[PDB]
Nucleic acid binder design. Structure first.
Lengths: 700, 300
DNA sequence: TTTTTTTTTTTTTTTT
């Protein structure tokens, strides 16, 4: 028999009772689906976690979906409870979903997540066939739905339908009034007639679901649509995004018929159209709510489009690196280029809610117009299939990129960022979606010229990439940070490390003195230096923090199209559901390191000589940068270009890695008893793998 | 040159080590302030004092604000260590504040307080300019502040401002509701509209800064403002008190915006106003925290 | 005592 069935029979007739199971045999996790925790008593002092998770264990005989007790949510937060792990259940309890007629829900009250399972069989049947239903929904609570395991803007599950194709509708007997006319007469007329518009901007999803509120699929997406008489902001309400979101895209002629015109929202701004001729309507807004007969939205095909209507054409503000160099800040633009680098999918905490996160990742789009790549801060645009599976050597096109500039720092910062109404599309060979635009044709011409010339731009994927480089002087660094939180204590650092969540990144500043720096030939005369101060105070340290370890996934690795899937999966966000690995995968140490140096280990003794720490120094600058003076100092972590070397062909005479390492060690030795201000980078790679890499050493 | 300079140069390179000063020269106390003793280990059976003291001993040349070892607070409880006295420091130590960029701090660890000085100079320069920063703050801690020397219900220091003046806020399109309106509708109002209240009673300050919890300006004052017939016990939190307490007098017409509404604190005792005709709303209370823009509190 | 941010809302009259 199966441990699942044994436990179920053991605790089936004692609902909501904590019962240690008779026998504990490891079970295999196969999925972790997240959803909102609702219908629980929030009066409790420890406010219930905002979200709860369902774990789909398997026992070799049957696989059953379980509801993890929210008290254990920290395990999923730190990615300890992965997919395909050998967890052992120490406590179990039943529970009946009164909103449904089914069986008990095995509740995992206590667990001991272990190691990976060598036998991950997804062919096992489901003990409770209700669990194996086509629409994958949460165990508890009416018509509930699942959210993306990490962020709230990524569509996830099966409710997100993608089967809305154009339909031929005859417009005879239809009025299709102009948007300006509607703006004039939306406060008097009763039956708002039809509208023929074209989507010009599609924005990310917005999850406004709150606990203990009678809300069903609380999603809203903002679409800007334009006709021959202006443009308006169209908003899709809950229960409509699931059916239409994955299908609606920019450039689709829609026929909205039964809508609701409201006064518009003052806390949300309407993006300016690419073509200024389009008159902007700001006093009006169109709300699309799900209706009984699904006719409120119709995707009119292009073939039916008549020039007589003169519908506005989807334009684009495509920009090239050279042009971007001359564009003021906050000047929206579009970028088409070749992905020559992709970074980890890091996460940041929303400033509004402490339990929500943004998923972002840095990518160095590049073109033939300049020698520097577009640095784009790619936040999730509710396009997980593209965002998660992005790889170098791919023609990448984003839609709405706000320009961000900072000239105070000596390394002038010029990186683009994705806006709310942005979009991501991967292009293939000649411009697939945007061939007509001349800039796309020029980019394709450059691609062909490079291909026939035998030149290939260097490619990288993943790694430790703290793009924003701290300024050259601590005063300028602190000019933005508050005085009370500017610095921390070497002792308090431990809590900072222990507070981060999956891929949450943090930057802290610590006051101390470099005591001993050691060089670790990383890839496959003096490498260690010790300070007399260290030899004296090493025996009187209250707590010597040991975080000078570099993980294999923090080393950027040169991309290889053949191992594309493996390389991508080694740096994406943790998948929600297990998927068996094709054949055997290679070793993450089997790929060449895009870096060009070995990592050092720096020991810092606090100003009071009581506490110490061991950070790891991971410079990303090549010796050519040293020779041409593209680095503020040898103790920094980035060259000014903030980009990896391209087709390195000039290291024949330049000092080798060992010479640069000796220079770095000597520079560190120059700071013997000097109170320096280190800038550390704390990133938690999940599964209790927190990397603490040094960024900059601000000397007096 | 000076005793201060000699001792500091002697003990700068040995933080958290106790060294008898090379020379013991009487030094005049020119100031004595009191602040919370957080950051100390509360695991010792003799729990360290809830407050520590900073003494601005002055030599003939300079005066450098020092730190009094909490074990010496007995000399200040009896007022034996007062301003204007002459004392002979016997033990010193160097401590570095890890939340500020600055030089070492002299840690007084044993004194022999004598008698009043014959000549006290208030014009002696400050050796360390950091000590001379106009918004005076305690030597230890990041955003710490000095309390009153003896009682905790008296504003003290430069954090307390009196610069607030009446402002002519236009009421062209300001949505002003009544207190009873919130009383009936405050659990459904996603946004709480503006208010136009008038102060009736202003309470004495209350310091709730415990040593272990990390709080900034643990100052809290309860103001009984009454808009229209209704009256509620508004309560200002955190660092809002030392920006509006020395300025707000009873009878000032306040315009509170971007506020919060919650349940009345269980042990709260709302005072009855002079006029009985008013309604004493005692179910919900408006909390005024420091919003990033300075529009939350505007007096008309 | 402490404690912040976010959106959601459907419907049968007028003629002068």
């Amino acid at each position: 028999r199966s441990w699942i069935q044994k436990v179920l029979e053991q605790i089936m007739d004692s609902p909501r009772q904590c019962v240690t199971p008779s026998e504990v045999v490891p079970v295999t996790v196969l999925a972790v689906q997240r959803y909102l925790l609702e219908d629980e008593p929030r009066d409790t002092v420890p406010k219930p976690p905002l979200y709860c998770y369902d774990v789909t264990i398997s026992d070799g005989v049957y696989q059953e979906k379980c509801y993890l007790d929210p008290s254990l949510n920290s395990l999923v937060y730190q990615n300890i409870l992965k997919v395909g792990i050998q967890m052992r259940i120490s406590r179990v309890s039943c529970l009946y979903n009164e909103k449904r007629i089914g069986q008990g829900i095995l509740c995992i009250d206590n667990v001991h997540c272990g190691e990976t399972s060598d036998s991950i069989s997804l062919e096992t049947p489901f003990r409770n066939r209700a669990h194996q239903e086509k629409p994958e929904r949460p165990l508890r609570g009416g018509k509930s739905h699942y959210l993306a395991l990490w962020n709230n803007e990524d569509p996830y599950g099966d409710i997100w339908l993608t089967d809305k194709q154009p339909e031929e509708h005859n417009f005879s007997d239809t009025k299709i009034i102009s948007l300006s006319h509607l703006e004039m007469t939306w406060t008097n007329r009763r039956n708002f007639p039809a509208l023929l518009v074209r989507i010009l901007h599609k924005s990310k999803l917005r999850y406004y679901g709150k606990p203990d509120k009678k809300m069903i699929e609380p999603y809203q997406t903002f679409l800007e649509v334009a006709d021959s008489s202006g443009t308006v902001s169209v908003i899709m309400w809950n229960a409509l995004c699931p059916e239409w979101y994955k299908s609606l895209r920019v450039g689709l002629v829609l026929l909205l018929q039964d809508y609701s015109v409201k006064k518009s929202y003052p806390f949300r701004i309407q993006p300016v159209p690419v073509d200024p001729q389009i008159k902007l309507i700001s006093t009006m807004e169109i709300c699309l709510n799900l209706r009984d007969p699904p006719t409120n939205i119709i995707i009119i095909p292009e073939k039916q489009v008549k020039p007589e209507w003169r519908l506005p054409k989807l334009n684009h503000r495509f920009t090239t690196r050279s042009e971007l160099d001359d564009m003021p800040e906050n000047c929206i633009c579009d970028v088409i280029g070749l992905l020559v680098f992709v970074g980890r999918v890091q996460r940041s905490k929303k400033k509004e809610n402490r339990e929500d996160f943004w998923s972002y990742r840095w990518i160095h789009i590049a073109d033939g117009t300049s020698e520097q790549p577009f640095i784009v801060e790619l936040f999730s645009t509710s396009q997980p299939e593209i965002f998660e599976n992005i790889y170098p050597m791919a023609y990448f096109v984003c839609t709405q990129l706000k320009v961000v500039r900072n000239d105070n720092q000596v390394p002038k910062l010029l990186y683009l960022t994705t806006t709310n109404e942005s979009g991501v599309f991967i292009t293939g060979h000649r411009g697939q979606p945007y061939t007509y635009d001349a800039k796309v044709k020029n980019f394709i011409q450059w691609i062909r010229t490079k291909s026939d010339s035998g030149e290939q731009k260097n490619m990288v994927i993943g790694g430790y990439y703290p793009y924003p480089p701290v300024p050259e002087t601590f005063s300028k660094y602190s000019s933005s940070i508050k005085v009370e939180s500017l610095l921390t204590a070497i002792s308090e650092v431990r809590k900072e490390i222990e507070d981060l969540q999956y891929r949450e990144q943090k930057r802290i500043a610590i006051q101390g003195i470099i005591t001993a720096i050691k060089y670790i030939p990383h890839s496959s005369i003096s490498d260690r230096w010790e300070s007399q101060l260290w030899r004296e105070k090493k025996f009187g340290l209250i707590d010597h923090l040991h975080y000078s370890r570099v993980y294999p996934e923090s080393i950027p690795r040169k991309f290889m199209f053949e191992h594309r899937k493996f390389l991508s999966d080694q740096y994406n966000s943790q998948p929600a559901k297990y998927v068996p690995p094709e054949g055997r995968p290679p070793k993450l140490d089997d790929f060449k390191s895009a870096r060009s140096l070995g990592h050092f280990e720096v020991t810092i003794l606090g100003l009071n000589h009581e506490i110490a720490i061991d950070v790891a120094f991971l410079p990303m600058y090549c010796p050519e940068d040293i020779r041409t003076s593209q680095i503020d100092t040898l103790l920094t972590s980035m060259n000014y270009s903030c980009a990896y070397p391209q087709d390195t062909t000039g290291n024949d005479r330049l000092p080798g890695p060992r010479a640069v390492a000796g220079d770095i060690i000597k520079a560190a030795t120059e700071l013997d008893r000097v109170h320096i201000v280190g800038i550390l980078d704390i990133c938690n790679l999940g599964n209790n793998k927190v990397e603490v890499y040094l960024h900059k050493i601000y000397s007096p």
